[PDB]
Amino acid sequence: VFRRFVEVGRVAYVSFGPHAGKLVAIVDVIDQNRALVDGPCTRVRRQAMPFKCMQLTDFILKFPHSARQKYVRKAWEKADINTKWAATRWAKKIEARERKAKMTDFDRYKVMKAKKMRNRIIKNEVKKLQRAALLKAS
Amino acid sequence: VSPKVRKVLQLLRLRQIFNGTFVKLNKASINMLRIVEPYIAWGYPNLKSV
Amino acid sequence: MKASGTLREYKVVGRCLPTPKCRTPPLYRMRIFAPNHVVAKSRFWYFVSQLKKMKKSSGEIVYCGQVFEKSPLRVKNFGIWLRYDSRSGTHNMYREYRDLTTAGAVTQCYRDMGARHRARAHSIQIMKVEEIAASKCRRPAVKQFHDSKIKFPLPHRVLRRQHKPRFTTKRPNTFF
Amino acid sequence: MKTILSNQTVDIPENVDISLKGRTVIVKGPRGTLRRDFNHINVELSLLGKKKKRLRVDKWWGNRKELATVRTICSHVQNMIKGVTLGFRYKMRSVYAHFPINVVIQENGSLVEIRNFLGEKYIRRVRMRPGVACSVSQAQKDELVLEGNDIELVSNSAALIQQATTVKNKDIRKFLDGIYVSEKGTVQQA
Amino acid sequence: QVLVLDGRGHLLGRLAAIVAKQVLLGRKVVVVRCEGINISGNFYRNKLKYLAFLRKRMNTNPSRGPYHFRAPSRIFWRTVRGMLPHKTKRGQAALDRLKVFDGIPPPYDKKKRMVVPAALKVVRLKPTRKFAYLGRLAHEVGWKYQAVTATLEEKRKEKAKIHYRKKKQLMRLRKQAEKNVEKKISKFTDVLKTHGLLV
RNA sequence: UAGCGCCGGAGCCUCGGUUGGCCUCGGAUAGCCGGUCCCCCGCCGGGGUCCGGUGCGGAGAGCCCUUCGUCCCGGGAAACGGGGCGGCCG
RNA sequence: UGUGGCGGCCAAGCGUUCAUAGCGACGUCGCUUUUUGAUCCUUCGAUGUCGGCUCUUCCUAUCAUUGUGAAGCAGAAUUCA
RNA sequence: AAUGCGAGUGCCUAGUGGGCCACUUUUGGUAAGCAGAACUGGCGCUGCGGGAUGAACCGAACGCCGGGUUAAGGCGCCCGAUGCCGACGCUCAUCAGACCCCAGAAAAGGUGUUGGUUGAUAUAGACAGCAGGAUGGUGGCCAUGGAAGUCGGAAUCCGCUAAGGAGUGUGUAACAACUCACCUGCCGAAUCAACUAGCCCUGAAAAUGGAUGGCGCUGGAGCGUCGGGCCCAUACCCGGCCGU
RNA sequence: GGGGGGCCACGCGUCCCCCGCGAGCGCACGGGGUCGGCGGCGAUGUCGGCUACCCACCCGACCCGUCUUGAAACACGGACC
RNA sequence: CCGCGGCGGUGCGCCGCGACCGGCUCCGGGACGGCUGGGAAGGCCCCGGCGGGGAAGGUGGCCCGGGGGCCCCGGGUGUUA
Ligand SMILES: [Mg+2]
Ligand SMILES: [Mg+2]
Ligand SMILES: [Mg+2]
Ligand SMILES: [Mg+2]
Ligand SMILES: [Mg+2]
Ligand SMILES: [Mg+2]
Ligand SMILES: [Mg+2]
Ligand SMILES: [Mg+2]
Ligand SMILES: [Mg+2]
Ligand SMILES: [Mg+2]
Ligand SMILES: [Mg+2]
Ligand SMILES: [Mg+2]
Ligand SMILES: [Mg+2]
Ligand SMILES: [Mg+2]
Ligand SMILES: [Mg+2]
Ligand SMILES: [Mg+2]
Ligand SMILES: [Mg+2]
Ligand SMILES: [Mg+2]
Ligand SMILES: [Mg+2]
Ligand SMILES: [Mg+2]
Ligand SMILES: [Mg+2]
Ligand SMILES: [Mg+2]
């Protein structure tokens, strides 16, 4: 059962292509596998785009099927898309993959030390919870 | 290579593949470039090309 | 003609040689679809040699420009009138496409004829392209997109990029 | 061309309780439960409507062969609703010229023995499908009655017992003998 | 140091072609559950395709002729060998690094099995196209051990289910312990958040 | 099983390749995953409800381990912890 | 592949009626190399040249037998597939 | 006139005088890897890259090497190169298809599916699907042993009409018997026919076991139209060395 | 022709139309590479030897002579020295 | 004869490294300008302003139908709310 659809005013995330990693708003459907799309606040010009290169999100903004970039901007700013997208967990893990790639060699050593200590502290509590659960039953 | 075409390719001094030459254009030149048309690729050069 | 890449849409004007008989020939304008202007002039001379009695040596190209799309940011219905050769017989058609540009619609038409009727680009002869209103369309494949509240999902997302995680552990998901 | 959306609709009555696990339709009511699995059709089934009065079948981006399967499901689910509410009854006569077709019923309706078909000494033993009960009826001379909930199983058992009594290496236009399906209907009327 | 590739749901030629390059690249590959491999096209067509292979024997002495192996593992091995220069000593050394099996042998039951998405049915085939299981195809051309392999696979699945429940028990225990020591792991966790490891 | 087998420091030849490990659900794809059991059945398992994630973060785009060494004195963490001999399960 | 053999398409007619159960003129399209031709590429410092006997395997364009469909199939017998 | 190139001339002279193949033109023959011509290019005399293999096909002709780049071909694996998040379509074969020569098919068909051309009728309510009614003249005249709306052939007109025609089916010696067309009944949105063009299927049968080169391939590794990127010949460019 | 930036323009003394030598000093996209730069190992087990002895692997690769349009030929001659 | 002396040439026993210069290549990153229909479109200025139109892939409304706690869905009228 489907939950995200291609309608007029669907926010999509562009996964690859030249405008990769950007949000766009679907303005009209040209063909079976192509939409006229426009991101006013994400620096995307109004252009044709295949459905293969967009990952559609759960954000719906209301504007007519032929309204121009001014009205799509006005609908984007009232719906306040750019902060809700960053508040969603999808952009948080995109930002996490960007941080882990930007991560340097000194940052690698510090993450190494902290992860080692945190893992040892977690494993000690795990062993204590094991022996507590075993001592309660047996 | 056909003999009539060999003679024109020698009068254009194109005796080897990927050889190039400058030819001024008139009726007597277009009617020879038509004879050697499938064997050459000619055109109008830029000043930077020269 | 080889339909290379996407086509560009050219306005080509030509005339005959001024003679003592015809001191000024009428100028003839044509709407050529070609990958470049060198192909466009050759197709102009082909079409005008078919219609009028005028050849490339007996005439000249007065103008050859690429005339652009007046509105490439709205989606339009394009009706294209065809004249093609089959293996046995030659036929006319009317086809409909949805595109932003006229040359993009004609480019789509060339792939459509090659796909469906195995018609090569030298047999295809475009004779009239017209912007068509949505109430004047005829093909149900084009008329089904004339919906103000259009809605569909992407039902079976086949996973592309099959070779960057090439040896993976989790099995791929197609539902999104 | 691919149609964007094709949908059809089954109106479910209030006597029937229906549930779905993906593309597996389960139907429960007065006579029992029927389960049919539809993972080979690749459509979208929706149990919309509060108290589940209505069932909707969707095909998105389908060709002409794929759009034919929608009302096939809408007929199968209606057949299950009809067979759980009213049931299925296949009344069938036996036609003979000289030798009376002797039909006896074994193991509470799950096996049927046919004797004296065209004067033969061979005994045709017909197994029935699980869920179908066969019985010799009354008020008619030579007639059997098949009972069940599944139209597939009932009619397939009727086809089995009809093809059991077939005439070999003769003119079948003249030797019009066998057990033939006469009437298809329900257990109780509507 | 070794690939273990699960054969279930994979297409036979695409999987075999992908294995054939990696095993020529000096890597040890072990392809497991060859009865779960499936072939595009309908089942009767694929059965006829194998029956035409069965009919091709040496007329004067069939003991020297083509060896028609009936196990699914040996069928997949025969497909991989046809994608290799097996009459040369680098091809034979490549064929030595391939190890095909039916079911999951007990070396590879407690080992994690990799998946090739470029050879899977659900990726490389349309959903409205029929396919043929190699296990049933081999069973109907003369593989005798479909029934034994089925019970031995089921007895393994009920055994690995217990391991999965014990693993989920430790997963609930570690997620409980993470909340229990959250006061004292707080300085070590935000430093993992600021470099993208735990966001 | 005949000068041979089984267990507990030295070196000499020869054959070579490698330069951390992943100790595991079943599987579905027009669908999944994990909790919760306040419900209902059982041999902790099975169904349903409910709550969370789903371009998989309880993510292989992943996880674990990470080695310069030793010494003195502290502050975190351990105290149920680190390593060394006989038995029971599987 | 002319010729031989085999198979189609159209259907004027035969079939008491009825083109196509079974056939099929006038035309026309093919297949095969178990017929004879046509050709001369291999072999003239030699490939033992007709049959029959013996023995093995293959083909199907199926005479019989297994399973079947159609008749101008009542049964029996017989045709077509 | 243009373009290009140093030319002219005299002795002596070997080998050859069986040829063959290809685009186009073309003779005889049913045809032939048949026989015989014209033109040009090849093979013979010649290796190299590609066509899996290969006298002649495509590219390109060759001193010994290094670097780079190409042609014709290709880029799932054999096997160098697409492991591009390539584009748009078409196609399911229980005989799929897969690249000049070239190595296997035709007429005729298909309510498989896709795209077109043309003509109808549809809210003055159509195609389905479930009834009435097909007769009065007339059992028409015609030719018959008789053909009565039905076995032949000239004809082919009226009434009542919501309809109804000297008429499409099954049958008798002529009878008897029986139904599409046309009209209303219910129902409420597009429907019907004739052609034509792609892929697939039928037509489609040979002998040792068997060949898109093989493995295999169906969100193609199939067909058509097309993008970038990549592979490499003795070919092209630069450089070294030998010889003329 | 009248009233801020680049110029391979910088003589003096006339007639007249237009109104034959300066020295020096260095730098270098300049007639084909040099360092006025270095580091390791080396006397009974190691250094160099492409070719020549044996073996291994990848790619390529049919036996020569001859007649012939065409030879690896199921065309002839040929055991070896 | 001594010096691990200076300049000039020739070179290292073997294995190696670096520097800059020049020739030939394959790439990458910036920056500047010309032409077109002296680009076509597009952005901002209340829809850039004012006035006049048009109609649908019809927004408000209004009505009709069917599942809801006023919000959705389907159809109809129609010219901007
Ligand atoms: Mg009989
Ligand atoms: Mg004949
Ligand atoms: Mg007759
Ligand atoms: Mg000859
Ligand atoms: Mg001989
Ligand atoms: Mg012999
Ligand atoms: Mg047969
Ligand atoms: Mg000849
Ligand atoms: Mg020569
Ligand atoms: Mg040559
Ligand atoms: Mg070939
Ligand atoms: Mg080279
Ligand atoms: Mg190849
Ligand atoms: Mg040179
Ligand atoms: Mg080789
Ligand atoms: Mg000789
Ligand atoms: Mg000869
Ligand atoms: Mg010769
Ligand atoms: Mg020879
Ligand atoms: Mg031979
Ligand atoms: Mg001789
Ligand atoms: Mg001899």
Side-chain angles (χ1 to χ4, degrees):
Chain A
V1 295
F2 312 105
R3 277 164 269 117
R4 298 165 168 160
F5 293 85
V6 176
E7 69 275 16
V8 168
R10 171 68 65 164
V11 178
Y13 174 80
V14 194
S15 78
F16 63 93
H19 294 297
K22 289 189 194 151
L23 297 178
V24 285
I26 302 188
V27 169
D28 198 357
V29 181
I30 300 177
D31 272 308
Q32 183 178 2
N33 47 6
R34 180 159 63 127
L36 174 77
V37 66
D38 184 19
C41 302
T42 44
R43 322 162 316 181
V44 187
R45 273 167 183 106
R46 180 175 276 202
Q47 69 202 82
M49 203 180 258
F51 290 122
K52 297 193 185 315
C53 77
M54 64 183 73
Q55 305 171 342
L56 73 165
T57 63
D58 62 358
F59 286 121
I60 297 170
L61 74 164
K62 307 188 182 236
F63 56 87
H65 82 93
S66 56
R68 42 209 185 83
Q69 189 274 331
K70 182 172 181 59
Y71 308 109
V72 184
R73 152 175 295 116
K74 287 184 185 298
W76 197 287
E77 293 179 353
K78 64 90 176 179
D80 186 74
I81 300 288
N82 291 80
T83 51
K84 314 197 173 223
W85 165 254
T88 49
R89 293 180 181 177
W90 189 348
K92 268 144 158 178
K93 70 181 88 145
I94 292 171
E95 162 83 18
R97 291 188 296 272
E98 274 188 47
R99 293 181 184 271
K100 200 181 162 168
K102 182 175 73 175
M103 170 145 170
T104 61
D105 192 37
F106 188 25
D107 291 331
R108 218 161 309 131
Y109 167 87
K110 303 187 293 181
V111 159
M112 183 177 176
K113 285 309 193 191
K115 184 174 73 69
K116 170 157 62 173
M117 194 68 232
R118 173 182 190 275
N119 277 335
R120 279 182 148 91
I121 294 175
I122 280 153
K123 290 174 70 175
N124 285 298
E125 198 63 37
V126 161
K127 291 174 70 175
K128 289 168 73 175
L129 262 69
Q130 293 192 147
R131 64 181 294 165
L134 185 62
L135 270 183
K136 286 299 295 312
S138 187
Chain B
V1 189
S2 298
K4 176 159 307 182
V5 184
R6 293 179 66 188
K7 179 62 155 211
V8 184
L9 277 176
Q10 289 166 354
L11 300 171
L12 293 183
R13 309 191 282 158
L14 307 169
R15 286 176 178 274
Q16 193 189 36
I17 197 182
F18 302 138
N19 272 21
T21 191
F22 287 115
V23 181
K24 75 185 175 199
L25 297 172
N26 49 15
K27 184 77 175 294
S29 178
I30 301 299
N31 281 28
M32 292 169 46
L33 302 173
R34 177 160 324 127
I35 285 177
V36 291
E37 183 178 1
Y39 293 170
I40 69 185
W42 65 285
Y44 312 137
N46 203 263
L47 173 57
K48 184 183 181 290
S49 294
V50 180
Chain C
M1 188 176 131
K2 183 175 174 66
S4 304
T6 197
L7 298 190
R8 305 153 191 221
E9 190 275 331
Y10 292 99
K11 162 204 172 167
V12 184
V13 194
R15 74 186 183 135
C16 182
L17 290 174
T19 51
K21 293 182 183 293
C22 50
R23 67 185 68 188
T24 186
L27 282 72
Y28 289 128
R29 183 179 63 83
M30 281 211 60
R31 214 200 164 170
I32 313 293
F33 302 86
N36 48 62
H37 53 92
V38 189
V39 174
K41 293 171 187 176
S42 178
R43 292 303 282 175
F44 176 81
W45 287 120
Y46 167 66
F47 283 136
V48 174
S49 291
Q50 270 195 351
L51 277 296
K52 307 291 184 180
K53 193 177 288 295
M54 183 179 72
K55 279 199 303 196
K56 185 178 187 288
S57 84
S58 295
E60 85 197 299
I61 296 290
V62 192
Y63 175 81
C64 183
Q66 166 171 8
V67 60
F68 316 118
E69 182 65 26
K70 292 177 70 68
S71 82
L73 308 186
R74 68 184 68 187
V75 58
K76 276 157 289 182
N77 300 305
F78 290 99
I80 310 184
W81 275 265
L82 277 296
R83 181 204 194 282
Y84 65 96
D85 285 305
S86 50
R87 314 182 209 287
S88 85
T90 186
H91 320 274
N92 310 295
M93 282 178 173
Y94 162 90
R95 317 191 59 93
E96 313 202 329
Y97 308 83
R98 266 176 78 81
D99 207 300
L100 304 175
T101 71
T102 304
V106 168
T107 300
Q108 184 178 2
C109 169
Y110 270 87
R111 325 273 173 251
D112 194 16
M113 302 297 294
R116 285 186 200 269
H117 309 276
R118 322 286 184 199
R120 276 73 180 180
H122 67 265
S123 62
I124 299 164
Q125 176 160 337
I126 311 286
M127 65 182 179
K128 182 173 72 175
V129 187
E130 183 178 1
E131 293 179 353
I132 301 299
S135 66
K136 293 163 58 197
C137 301
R138 292 145 61 171
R139 298 319 171 209
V142 185
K143 291 177 70 68
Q144 77 179 327
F145 289 97
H146 302 155
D147 215 19
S148 44
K149 36 183 186 295
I150 190 72
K151 184 175 84 76
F152 50 89
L154 307 163
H156 196 297
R157 298 284 261 177
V158 65
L159 181 140
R160 308 320 282 190
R161 200 176 70 189
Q162 305 166 3
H163 292 266
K164 267 178 226 166
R166 165 185 271 221
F167 289 114
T168 188
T169 316
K170 42 172 185 59
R171 281 179 140 93
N173 189 12
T174 73
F175 192 81
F176 293 109
Chain D
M1 80 147 276
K2 280 165 172 156
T3 309
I4 297 170
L5 169 63
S6 174
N7 53 12
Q8 269 205 18
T9 301
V10 171
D11 277 292
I12 303 159
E14 68 160 70
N15 261 345
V16 192
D17 183 23
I18 190 167
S19 81
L20 282 72
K21 295 188 287 185
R23 272 164 294 165
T24 300
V25 177
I26 297 89
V27 163
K28 176 190 226 293
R31 291 175 50 90
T33 313
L34 285 178
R35 184 169 316 221
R36 210 172 193 289
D37 191 62
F38 289 111
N39 296 295
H40 50 90
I41 305 280
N42 189 359
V43 293
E44 184 191 32
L45 309 181
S46 296
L47 211 52
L48 59 83
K50 265 68 67 176
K51 96 183 202 178
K52 318 304 179 175
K53 300 182 189 55
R54 184 176 64 246
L55 170 68
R56 182 179 63 84
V57 183
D58 281 331
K59 186 69 186 175
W60 299 96
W61 299 111
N63 51 49
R64 180 196 177 79
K65 291 274 190 176
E66 293 179 353
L67 296 194
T69 49
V70 170
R71 184 177 182 270
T72 298
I73 287 179
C74 279
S75 296
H76 287 333
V77 179
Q78 276 173 15
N79 273 330
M80 302 192 294
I81 286 166
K82 192 205 192 84
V84 171
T85 300
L86 306 175
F88 277 107
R89 181 192 299 265
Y90 267 46
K91 291 173 71 175
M92 65 182 179
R93 310 284 322 263
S94 79
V95 180
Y96 54 83
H98 199 247
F99 301 102
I101 302 184
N102 288 333
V103 176
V104 298
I105 306 302
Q106 305 293 324
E107 65 183 1
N108 296 115
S110 281
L111 192 150
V112 173
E113 318 199 15
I114 314 294
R115 326 174 84 79
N116 209 55
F117 170 74
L118 268 179
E120 293 179 353
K121 294 273 182 301
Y122 175 65
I123 303 156
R124 297 141 153 81
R125 276 176 199 75
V126 184
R127 299 288 303 164
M128 295 296 172
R129 300 283 146 177
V132 182
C134 185
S135 70
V136 177
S137 68
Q138 279 75 39
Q140 294 297 109
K141 181 71 199 68
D142 313 289
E143 183 178 1
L144 285 154
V145 163
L146 288 146
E147 294 293 328
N149 291 333
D150 195 359
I151 182 169
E152 299 292 329
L153 300 188
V154 166
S155 63
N156 178 40
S157 52
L160 284 153
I161 191 167
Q162 171 162 358
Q163 282 189 353
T165 52
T166 187
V167 184
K168 299 292 180 68
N169 64 7
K170 289 288 178 312
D171 191 2
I172 66 166
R173 311 174 312 175
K174 180 64 174 277
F175 287 85
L176 296 155
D177 300 333
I179 307 189
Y180 298 93
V181 172
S182 67
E183 200 78 22
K184 306 182 205 107
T186 61
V187 183
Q188 69 275 16
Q189 295 298 109
Chain E
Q1 71 172 15
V2 59
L3 276 179
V4 184
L5 301 180
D6 179 36
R8 188 193 65 87
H10 279 97
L11 298 174
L12 187 152
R14 295 182 184 272
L15 185 57
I18 279 183
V19 173
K21 195 62 171 172
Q22 295 295 301
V23 72
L24 262 181
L25 288 161
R27 179 209 271 289
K28 296 186 288 183
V29 192
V30 175
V31 182
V32 183
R33 293 176 76 186
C34 293
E35 69 275 16
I37 314 185
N38 63 7
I39 298 169
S40 54
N42 67 98
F43 175 76
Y44 188 93
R45 184 176 177 86
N46 283 117
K47 186 175 181 180
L48 283 182
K49 186 180 289 293
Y50 201 84
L51 283 187
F53 174 54
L54 282 191
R55 270 177 272 130
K56 285 154 185 41
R57 66 182 180 179
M58 178 164 181
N59 175 77
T60 58
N61 201 347
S63 47
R64 305 161 79 113
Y67 299 132
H68 327 282
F69 284 91
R70 325 281 164 121
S73 61
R74 307 296 305 161
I75 283 169
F76 182 74
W77 187 89
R78 170 93 181 219
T79 302
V80 174
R81 169 193 103 189
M83 280 148 176
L84 287 181
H86 69 96
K87 284 197 178 152
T88 74
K89 288 202 183 289
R90 70 184 289 265
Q92 293 179 356
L95 265 183
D96 202 25
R97 296 160 203 143
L98 178 65
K99 204 181 292 181
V100 286
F101 289 120
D102 298 277
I104 301 298
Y108 310 100
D109 62 357
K110 311 185 161 36
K111 292 181 181 179
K112 183 88 144 60
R113 304 168 289 251
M114 291 292 255
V115 172
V116 177
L120 286 168
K121 180 184 72 65
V122 72
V123 169
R124 306 297 313 203
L125 290 184
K126 288 186 194 292
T128 59
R129 309 283 190 201
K130 317 183 73 213
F131 56 93
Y133 294 110
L134 190 54
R136 174 162 175 255
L137 188 153
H139 159 67
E140 293 180 354
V141 301
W143 183 43
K144 317 186 172 198
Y145 310 110
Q146 174 183 71
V148 175
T149 300
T151 78
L152 280 175
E153 268 300 292
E154 182 65 26
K155 182 174 72 68
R156 180 196 64 77
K157 291 179 178 68
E158 48 173 59
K159 193 69 61 66
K161 187 68 69 181
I162 309 166
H163 158 67
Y164 179 62
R165 279 74 177 272
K166 299 294 187 291
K167 180 166 170 164
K168 283 202 308 211
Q169 183 62 255
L170 276 296
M171 186 64 72
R172 268 188 281 95
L173 273 179
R174 65 181 293 275
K175 300 296 209 93
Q176 183 62 255
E178 270 168 74
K179 182 175 73 175
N180 277 0
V181 298
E182 190 276 331
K183 180 67 174 66
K184 56 190 284 196
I185 68 180
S186 297
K187 289 174 68 177
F188 299 129
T189 299
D190 52 349
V191 64
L192 265 69
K193 294 181 176 67
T194 188
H195 294 121
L197 276 297
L198 205 60
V199 192

